Amino acid sequence: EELQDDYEDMMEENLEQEEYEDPDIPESQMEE
Amino acid sequence: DAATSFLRAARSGNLDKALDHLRNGVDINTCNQNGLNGLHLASKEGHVKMVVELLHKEIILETTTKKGNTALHIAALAGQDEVVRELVNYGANVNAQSQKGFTPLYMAAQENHLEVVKFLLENGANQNVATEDGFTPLAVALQQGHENVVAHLINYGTKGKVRLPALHIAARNDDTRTAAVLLQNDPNPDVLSKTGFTPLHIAAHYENLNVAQLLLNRGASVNFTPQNGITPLHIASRRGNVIMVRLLLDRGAQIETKTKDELTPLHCAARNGHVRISEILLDHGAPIQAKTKNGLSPIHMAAQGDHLDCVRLLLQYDAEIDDITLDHLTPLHVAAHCGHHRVAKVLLDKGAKPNSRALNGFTPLHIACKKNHVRVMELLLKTGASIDAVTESGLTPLHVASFMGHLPIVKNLLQRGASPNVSNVKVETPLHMAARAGHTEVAKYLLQNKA
Predict the structure, then answer these.
(1) How far apart are alpha carbons B239 and B316 in whole angstroms?
(2) Which of B164, B172, B294 sits opposite A25 (nearest CB)?
(3) CB-closest option in A7, A22, A30 to B261
(4) Taken in order B374, B380, B381, B383, is the CA torsion positive or negative?
């Protein structure tokens, strides 16, 4: 192969659009 | 006569003779009586190096023969997969039609060139384009009995362009010659992929400085903002590309741009621990108190990622050491939640309040005891955190540690004089929390001390 970087999906995975977002605020309430 | 020798060298693959003829002054766009220039003759015989060299010599890529065929048509009809790939990478129109209406996909399909068909379909060739007689690549493949071509044409259908635009591929590989040819053909440097990113984004991702400078000199937007708000400066800051960050700031990148989550490039640099990029942005005027949608500042991002030197640098640039998110979490709260005792120590040595209160009254000591982070607890208790502090529900750190079952933290708290007789708003003691969660060892150690 060695040419997956020419495709839209692999390039989108490489660019890592999720790394530019704020995921959430970790609260972790102790109450059950 | 020199042009004839150049064409013969192009046909025979003699690259040295063709280059010598071009040096002597032979027109690059010369062609024989059939209209086939050097590019056509090189494409017919599979001479990839000759094709690349002639494309570098500003030969007209979309030249047509007397039958209306381009170089891509000839390479598809001749079955030269490498030449087809090279022509497509340099910007050949895969949907060009000849005089009788044939397309490169049709010519590959009629000659059972399965690899060429696959590559053209992946690059956006439309199989619905018919000739003057109404035939399609599927129709001629069915007529000629090319079963594999028929199968692939039926299965692919209209999946469309799955490949990147050629300029994006050139920017990924830092290929300045291919990018120069592409920009000579198509003047626009801001061609968009299916995701919405320009080739400048790709160049900034891989820190391909040469192609990035080439794109910026041709008129690329240094502050091209897609729907997600991710600028090339954001990508360069996130990836750690210091030289790319400097290049983008030199060409006029906006430093206060926010993404859809309101992340500034300072946030991207701080969350990944890039100290030099953060310093460059702060020296260029980055707001150090910029907040995301959740209220996180860059120091929150740096503390979250255990980026010690980034926290030091931000504190050196007058960052608020007790900045609060929407949940009122200080960077000390984040360090206690993530177990980063080094970040917590750096924050505490510079005056961060050890007894800061979150929304539910949780202190950093409470969060350290909840997550079994003993070292953060030790540093907080050394730096004056209240061991008997209560939340809004009356929970002491011993309450949280006993409920969570973290036996070493329970033992450490009891060795320092914490009282197991404390009570919640429900009057429940740490022994109640240990018994309601089935922690036999924690309950036994609580009983052995004062209960």
Answers:
(1) 23
(2) B294
(3) A22
(4) positive
